[PDB]
Amino acid sequence: DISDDFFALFLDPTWVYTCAYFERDDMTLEEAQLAKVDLALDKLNLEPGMTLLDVGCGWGGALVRAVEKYDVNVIGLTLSRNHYERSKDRLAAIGTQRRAEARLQGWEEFEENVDRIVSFEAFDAFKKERYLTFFERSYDILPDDGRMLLHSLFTYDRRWLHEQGIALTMSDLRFLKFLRESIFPGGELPSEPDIVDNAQAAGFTIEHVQLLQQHYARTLDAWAANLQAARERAIAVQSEEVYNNFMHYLTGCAERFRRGLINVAQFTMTK
């Protein structure tokens, strides 16, 4: 696995490794990551004491913000031990009377009632055979007035891209191979209908779709600039091969968000 010490060289202090939201053009990376979390959590209409489930909680940045700003009980799920350990430690260091727990557990095994669900860039890594099952389970554990904010990457097919004046280049195919054949996201993404049609089949209404395509291009630019500035320490923690691979991933994904080849969006999902 890639060490937390490597990610610490280019992530902001929230340890959020998903698309930020530069709500104001002059926000720092940290302010834009908190704005992204707040943007999602505001759509859930949280009241203090509600229980929020975070599917794919990462290193705990969103849950920590959820407790601190919104005063909710939180459950975070992750299958990554490095993610679980940091989430566990950070939530315990919060001074709160609320429940704040991280679990080394997949959503497929989680069956408690919660009031609201949020998920940042976990869905686009699910198997397509689990798309509907995820929304059926999400629907089932939410109350009658429950809400879910699904933040997810998705891709476009050749024909839609052509209608938008975009074509995939040989360079784009070589990058697509490098994704699947290495350890990075973006390979085998869902389409937008994969999200919308399965969510609606499970009974959800799509209240709102907010695209963040160019916010991700800026986020990836910032991670790449941070990593370049810390290149020597990055190579010491890992290796030159890993540094160059990460730099190829970050700049290559930023380029393809700017070109419009893929997208990222927050789907406000109601019952």
Q: Domains (ranges, CATH) in the chain?
A: 4-270 (3.40.50.150)
Strand pairing category for 147-155 and 205-211 = unpaired
Active site residue 19: no
Q: Where are the alpha helices (DSSP H) in 43-80?
A: 61-70
Judge whether 15 is annotated as a binding position.
no
Radius of gyration for the alpha carbons in the chain, expressed in angstroms and rounded: 18
- Give the contacts of 175 (CB within 8 A, at least 6 positions apart): 252, 256
Rounded Cα distance between 20 and 259, Å, is 18
* Helix (H/G/I), strand (E/B), else coil: 142: coil
Rounded Cα distance between 131 and 209, Å, is 18
Q: Which amino acid is residue 153, in one-letter code?
A: L
Given the residues 148, 202, 222, 253, select the one marked as catalytic. 253
Judge whether 57 is annotated as a binding position.
yes
Please, what sign has the CA dihedral across residues 117, 123, 127, 132? positive
Judge whether 203 is annotated as a binding position.
no
* Helix (H/G/I), strand (E/B), else coil: 159: helix
- The structure was resolved to a resolution in Å of 1.9
Structure-token pair, residue 74: 């939180």
Instruction: Decide: 263 and 189 in contact? Cβ < 8 Å.
Output: no
Residue 247 vs residues 87, 228, 242, 271: alpha-carbon distances, Å: 26, 8, 8, 41
* Helix (H/G/I), strand (E/B), else coil: 202: coil
Residue 60, by phi and psi: left (phi above 0), alpha (psi -120 to 50) or beta?
Answer: left
Residue 145: CB atoms within 10 A of its CB come to: 9
167 phi, psi to nearest 5 deg: -125, 145
Judge whether 58 is annotated as a binding position.
yes
Strand pairing category for 100-104 and 73-78 = parallel
Rounded Cα distance between 66 and 26, Å, is 23
CA angle 45, 49, 55 (to 5 degrees): 65
Instruction: Decide: 104 and 84 in contact? Cβ < 8 Å.
Output: yes
Q: Exposed e or buried b for every residue in 71-88, given b needs 16+ CB within 10 A?
A: ebbbbbbbeeeebbbbbb
Judge whether 81 is annotated as a binding position.
yes
Rounded Cα distance between 44 and 24, Å, is 22
Please, what sign has the CA dihedral across residues 79, 82, 10, 74? positive
| Beta sheet of 100-104, edge-to-edge order | 100-104, 73-78, 51-55, 116-120, 147-155, 262-270, 205-211
Rounded Cα distance between 97 and 262, Å, is 41
Rounded Cα distance between 145 and 28, Å, is 35
Crossing angle of helices 29-42/61-70, nearest 10°? 70
Judge whether 79 is annotated as a binding position.
yes
Rounded Cα distance between 248 and 86, Å, is 27
Rounded Cα distance between 145 and 141, Å, is 11
Instruction: Decide: 44 and 270 in contact? Cβ < 8 Å.
Output: no
Q: Which amino acid is residue 152, in one-letter code?
A: S
DSSP 191: B
Nearest by Cα to 114 from 144, 142, 78 = 142
Judge whether 187 is annotated as a binding position.
no
Judge whether 250 is annotated as a binding position.
no
